[PDB]
Structures are given as C-alpha cells and as structure tokens.
C-alpha cells in the first residue's frame, strides 16, 4: 500500500510539474523587458534609533506608519516614535530570547515570541498607564519564529514545530492548527485581505494556508536551503521569499510557480529579511554581508547597497505609506532609511 | 520649537533611556552559561549541582550571578537558533562516560558517545562560537569506573593501545575531544572529569568563567 501511495505521490508531483511547465508561457524577464529601470536608489540614514543594548532580531511598523516596535535579546520590546526618536514604551520581556514581534492593526497590542515557545500579548492602551501582559499563548512545543496579528482578537503564529497556528486572544486556545511542513517554519507574511497567509520553512518550501478553512492550498518549491524570510506582494497575488542560498525568489499566487530569482555572483550571504514597497516595485532584502542590497521587483537588477550596519540585518520593514524603510540589525541600532529627493 | 508635552515626551524618553542603561549595565554584570547537553547524558544532573523551551537556572557563587540556559529540551533545528546565544561567556558541554559501549537506542548503528562527539564537533568549530570557551564535563564517571574493566574501550575506539586502567583510558577520552577544536588560537576548552556526589562542580565553573573574564578584560585594556 505504501509503495502504491509513494508512487502515487510521485505521479502527483509530476502532474503538477507538467501543469506548471505548460502554463509557463514566458519568464517575467522576457515580457517585462521594455520597461525602464528604477535607477540608482540611493538612501540616507534619516534616523539612527539607538536605545537597544543587545542584538535585534525583530521589528514591525504600526498601522500609522509612525510607531515601530523592536525586539532585542536584552529583554526589551521598545516602541519608538520614528518621527522624533522618542521611546513611547519600554516593555521588559519575561524571556530575553525573543526572535519575533508584531504590532496590532488597531495599535493597542504588541506580541513577542522566541525560544520561550510562548506568544505574549501586551496591552498598550491601558487605564493604569503601564503596559501589561494581556495573555500568554501556550501550546507550541517548539521555538516560535514569527507571529502576525490578524486583528485585535486573532493572531497567526509560526513556530519551529513545522506547524502554524491561529489563536484567540480572549480564550487563549488554538482555533486552527496549520500542519504539513517537513521543516521548521521561520517566517510568515499575512496577506492584505487577511484571508490567506503563506509561510516559508526550513525545508525550502512555501505553502499557502487558509485561515478561514484551515488547510494548505498551494505549495511552492525551488529553493535549495532554509527559507529564512518571506513577504507578500501588495496586490495580494504574489509573494517573495528569502533563503540561505542568497537567491531571493518571487512566486505568483495564480500561476503557482516561481517567476524570477534575485541572485548575484558576489553575494553568497544568506537573506534574513525580505520586504516589498508600496507599489511592489522595490524589493528590499536584508543580507548577511551587513548590506541590504535593493533588488528591482521586475528586472532582478540591484539598485542600492544600504550598507550602514556593522552586523547582519536581521529585520527590515517598509511602512504602510512607503515613506521609510527601517533596517534594524544586530548592531543594536535601527536605521530609518528614506529616499531623498 | 518644541511643544509643552513634546518637551515632556522627550523627558519621558530620557527616563526610559536611563532605565535601559541601568538594566543594560546590570545585564553586563552577569554570566550567561549555555548548557548544550547530550542525549540523556547531562543537563539533568549538573543543573541541580549549581543550585518548555529555555529554562534559565540562576545560581550565585562568590558574589557572581550566573545565568544557565538548558536548551536541551528543544528538539528543533539547532542551527536556526544557535545564533541567539552568540556572546555567552562559556558553553557548558556535557558528555556521559557510560556511552562509550552503549549504542544509540534510536539509531542502533553508532554508539551514543560518537553522537555526542559529532554534536561537540559542530559546536566547537561553529562560526559564531569561535571566541566563547567550552567547559566540557565528563559526568557519571563512577559508572565508567567498573564499566571500562568489564567492557573494553575497543568497542568505541579500537585504536586505544592501553590496558583496562581508568586513568589511561580516561586520558584518551580527554584527548579525543580537544582535536575537534579548530580555532585553537581564540578558544580553549576546560575539560574536567566529575562524579555525581562531588560538590566541586560549581567551583570549577567559576574558575573557568574567571579565565573568560580575564580574557575579556585583556581585550578591553588593549593587550591580548
């Protein structure tokens, strides 16, 4: 029976391979060749947020595109005012080993997670005036890598148990458990419509999950090593991935196949963070060579360096309005990049 | 140029900044001892000796407050979170001395001791763990006392040209772990055979950490 099932699985893999090959009319490079290049996108360190005493593994902008929250191994979850370099709050975490942080779409909650296997929800808009733990979400048996806020009541967390989950803040129980990965899930990216979310894992595979349903829709492959980071295209019909192979790749939702690859001969360092722009044309990526080489989302040509960090850039996120690109790195300093006129 | 509460907002940040510096200085006054135990070898006995995932154990000796993280509980990919511990003062490793003859139950192919050596090999010459020392611990040596006499060491290391004497065989065990260290110019391991009832486990860790403190002080003064 297993022999037949194993054969059947190989046949199914070949069946989807033929469908992807048949639908592959042409590469994105060939069709989008008449378009002009973006040009030399030079950036300047407008702000130099310097409050963290240790390595920075996560950051996330707010919905207002002004407040950002950074998580560091010091044990702090500082919430900064990027406009004036003011620290609105300095949340002391229970466990110093935090590798993910999130900002609620409403802005009243921030979540942290890491090697403690617990996603801790913090309440900002409180009467007492001091941030407090709203609820600690437990149930994951492995290290938690990335958590994104669906809304003020639902949060999607991806851990190292090769499974993603959906939680309810009021109750604290896993409403849905997304399983199917064969490797540790390193990052997830909530879609703008908040109806689907994709997450890359250590098995060099990215799967399309459905929060409403609870099972995987499409599975994407092509990478050779662990997918460290993932981001979703603004239109909601594509998503980019970053892996240790130094070849960031763009995948199409409808086409169900890889479109382009972003690799350079000089670059061999792994990718720790990937983020698009407002129009989905400026594919920011945080490499391990202390740089953040800007990649064109339609030409696969480098358009920037962003080399201003002493250590690896662990996190990087564009704002909702696209007016700033924070590039928080292991050097304990965040950097609010911006394109000068 | 600054409003009434805009000036107060900056004042609030200064209080926040002072708390971070005050708490950051306290964190720099602490020793972080990572504990990479093997499979049913360590991180269960020594953890009690110095008084779901990360289980930080705190014990104070000689007015020094050590933080000991036992990450052995986690079963995920080690390479994807080992960078979180980059910068620890020392890495307390543990290898059982009774695993020389016992084979791995799960693998049923290679003995448990080689798996620890393979695990030790990756940790010793890891890219991030080049400066941090390794306080190697050979625990449960009391069982190894009579195990070596009844069971020869040729099961694990047939190249061992020695008799059933514990001291002759134990020295080879020490010599079989130092070679795995590649960066011999920036990291020295303090191997120490220890029993179960001995109370000197705490003292040796403090002595090995003190050597790391001296080396760190040397880098600051411009010397080493």
């Amino acid at each position: 029976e297993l022999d037949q099932l194993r054969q059947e699985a190989e046949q199914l893999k070949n069946q989807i391979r033929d469908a992807r090959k048949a639908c592959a009319d042409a590469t994105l490079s060939q069709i989008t060749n008449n378009i002009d290049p973006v040009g030399r996108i030079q950036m300047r360190t407008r702000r130099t947020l310097r409050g963290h005493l240790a390595k920075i593994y996560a950051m996330h902008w707010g919905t207002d595109s002004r407040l950002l929250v950074s998580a560091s191994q010091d044990g702090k979850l500082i919430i900064w005012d990027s406009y004036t370099t003011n620290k609105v709050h300095a949340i002391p975490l229970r466990s110093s080993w935090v590798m993910t942080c999130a900002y609620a779409p409403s802005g009243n909650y921030v979540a942290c997670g890491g090697l403690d296997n617990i996603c801790s929800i913090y309440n900002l808009k409180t009467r007492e005036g001091n941030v407090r733990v709203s609820r600690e979400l437990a149930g994951h048996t492995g290290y938690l890598s990335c958590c994104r806020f669906l809304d003020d009541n639902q949060i999607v967390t991806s851990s190292g148990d090769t499974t993603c989950a959906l939680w309810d803040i009021e109750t604290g129980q896993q409403t849905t458990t997304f399983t199917g990965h064969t490797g540790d899930v390193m990052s997830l990216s909530l879609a703008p419509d908040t109806r689907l979310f994709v997450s890359g894992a250590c098995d060099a595979s990215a799967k399309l999950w459905d929060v409403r349903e609870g099972m995987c829709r499409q599975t994407f492959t092509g990478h050779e090593s662990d997918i460290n980071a993932i981001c979703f295209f603004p239109n909601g019909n594509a998503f980019a991935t970053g892996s240790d192979d130094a070849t960031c790749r763009l995948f199409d939702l409808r086409a169900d196949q890889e479109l382009m690859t972003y690799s350079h001969d000089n670059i061999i360092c792994g990718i720790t963070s990937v983020s698009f722009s407002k129009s989905g044309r400026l594919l920011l990526a945080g490499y391990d060579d202390f740089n953040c080489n800007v990649w064109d989302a339609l030409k696969a040509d480098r358009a920037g360096v962003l080399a201003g960090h002493d250590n690896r850039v662990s996190c990087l996120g564009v704002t909702d309005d696209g007016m700033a690109v924070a590039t928080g790195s292991w050097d304990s300093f965040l950097k609010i990049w911006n394109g000068s006129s | 140029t600054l409003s009434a509460e805009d000036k107060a907002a900056v004042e609030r940040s200064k209080m926040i900044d002072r708390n971070l510096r005050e708490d950051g200085e306290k964190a720099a006054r602490e020793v972080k001892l990572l504990l990479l135990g093997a499979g049913e070898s360590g991180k269960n006995t020594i953890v009690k000796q110095m008084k779901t995932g990360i289980v930080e154990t705190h014990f104070t000796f000689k007015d020094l407050h050590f933080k000991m993280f036992d990450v052995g509980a986690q079963r995920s990919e080690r390479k994807k979170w080992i960078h979180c511990f980059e910068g620890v003062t020392a890495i307390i490793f543990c290898v059982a001395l009774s695993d020389y003859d016992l084979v791995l139950a799960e693998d049923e192919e290679m003995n448990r001791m080689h798996a620890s050596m393979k695990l030790f090999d990756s940790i010793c010459n890891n890219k991030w763990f080049t400066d941090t020392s390794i306080i190697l611990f050979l625990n449960k040596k009391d069982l190894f006392e009579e195990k070596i006499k009844k069971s020869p060491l040729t099961i694990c290391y047939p190249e061992y040209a020695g008799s059933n004497t514990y001291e002759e065989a134990a020295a080879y065990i020490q010599c079989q772990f130092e070679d795995l260290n590649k960066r011999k110019d920036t990291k020295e391991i303090y191997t120490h055979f220890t029993c179960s009832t001995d109370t000197k486990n705490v003292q040796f860790v403090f002595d090995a950490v003190t050597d790391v403190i001296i080396k760190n002080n040397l880098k600051d003064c411009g010397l080493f």
Epitope: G129 | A4, E5, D6, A8, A9, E11, M15
Partner: single-chain antibody
C-alpha cells in the same frame, strides 16, 4: 484609578498648610501630576505641576515661588506645600494626572477635590450659559489669543465637563481625539483660532459647565466656562 486628596479646611490669612494627594490604582511614577484650583462661581486655574521623576517643575505666574510641589513615589502620594495663603487662594483644588507620549490623553482623570476656605494665552468663551433641550445639537465655541496649531500639526485643545457635584472629566483631547469612556455624541474640530464643540443630542449627563483649555504654552490658561442648562 483613585485620587483621594487631603489637607483642606479653614485657614487664617498668611498661614501654611500641606495638601496631600494619594494615588492608587495606576502607575503613579510614570504619570505626571497637575494641581488645578476652582474658585467658587469661577473657572478653573492652573496652579502647579510636577513631572515624572520630579524632573521639571513649573508654577503659575500668580503663585510662582510662593508655592512648592513635591511627590513621593514610594508612597504613591503627591504633596503641595502652601505658604502665606491669601484671600484669593480659596478654591476647590483638584489632583489631576497626565501622561505625555505620542497618542496619549493628558489630563485624563481628575481627583475628588479639596476646598481651602481661607504673554499668557487668553481663552474666552462667547457665552457662559446656553439653554439646551434633549435631542438637539449645540456647538460650544471658544477663542484663543494666538494660534494653537503647532508645526507638529496638533491643535492643543482639551475639553472638560464639570457635572454638578462632580470633578471635571475630559471629553476631547487635541481638539479631534475623543477620550476613553466619552460617548461618541461629543465631537469637535476647527483651526488654531476657530474653536467649536459639535455636541450631538444631549442627555441627562451632559449638564454642567464646559471648559476649553490651551496647552501650547505651559501657563495653561483655562476658559471662562459655558454652562448647559437642562
């Protein structure tokens, strides 16, 4: 969030008394404190202020030097030392808290109140009393000597409602943002000089005196006060 105040009572002219405000139910250390007086049949007036950590201390011009303010965060208490009390100093003193960060609501909660029976921006209200009826819409307006719109883009207005027998309660902070717990029927807008408070259908709790307070320059001059007759 309770602010019990003590130290009030009859005093002789020129005497000295200490006013103690007790803070419980919130992080007193991280909250700035304000002292606001309320003379009988008169509008509110800012008295003194102490910052978080006792960093910056300010006093009103009429009370500068003559009064001193201190806090004791281990005991979660506020102290206002009164020296050389005159006949003008009589008022209904209130203990007011305020936190200062981006998106905060300063002057959110007010204390119970204690009575002591012994270049500035001029905020003027058009009328001191407007009759109202349930189901109607009223627009309380105020005036400012100088523009309150800082370059940051904020119109520094704080609306307060003083229910009879009750301490003033914040309604709208920064002239656009509604405070926590305030019904949505309250609304306000305007420019740095044009001021209004577009109130929806009035209810039983809408009675009292409405105050407009400026915050661009720290003297913190309150408005004349408009009463809403039932």
């Amino acid at each position: 969030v309770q602010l019990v105040e003590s130290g009030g009572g009859l005093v002789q002219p020129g005497g000295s008394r200490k006013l103690s405000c007790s803070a419980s139910g919130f992080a007193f250390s991280s909250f700035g404190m304000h002292w606001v007086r309320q003379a009988p049949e008169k509008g509110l007036e800012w008295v003194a202020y102490i910052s978080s950590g006792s960093g910056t201390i300010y006093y009103a011009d009429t009370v500068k030097g003559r009064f001193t303010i201190s806090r004791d965060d281990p005991k979660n208490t506020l102290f206002l030392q009164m020296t050389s009390l005159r006949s003008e100093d009589t008022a209904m003193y209130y203990c007011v808290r305020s936190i200062y960060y981006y998106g905060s609501s300063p002057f959110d909660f007010w204390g119970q109140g204690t009575t002591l029976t012994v270049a500035d921006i001029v905020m003027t209200q058009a009328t001191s009393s407007v009759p109202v009826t349930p189901g109607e819409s009223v627009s309380i307006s105020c005036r400012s000597s100088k523009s309150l719109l800082h370059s940051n883009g904020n119109t520094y207005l704080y609306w307060f409602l003083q229910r009879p027998g009750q301490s003033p309660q914040l309604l709208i902070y920064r002239m656009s943002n509604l405070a926590s717990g305030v019904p949505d029927r309250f609304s306000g807008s305007g420019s740095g000089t044009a001021f209004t408070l577009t109130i929806s259908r009035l209810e039983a709790e809408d009675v009292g005196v409405y105050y407009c307070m400026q915050h661009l320059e720290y003297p913190l001059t309150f408005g004349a006060g408009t009463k809403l007759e039932l």
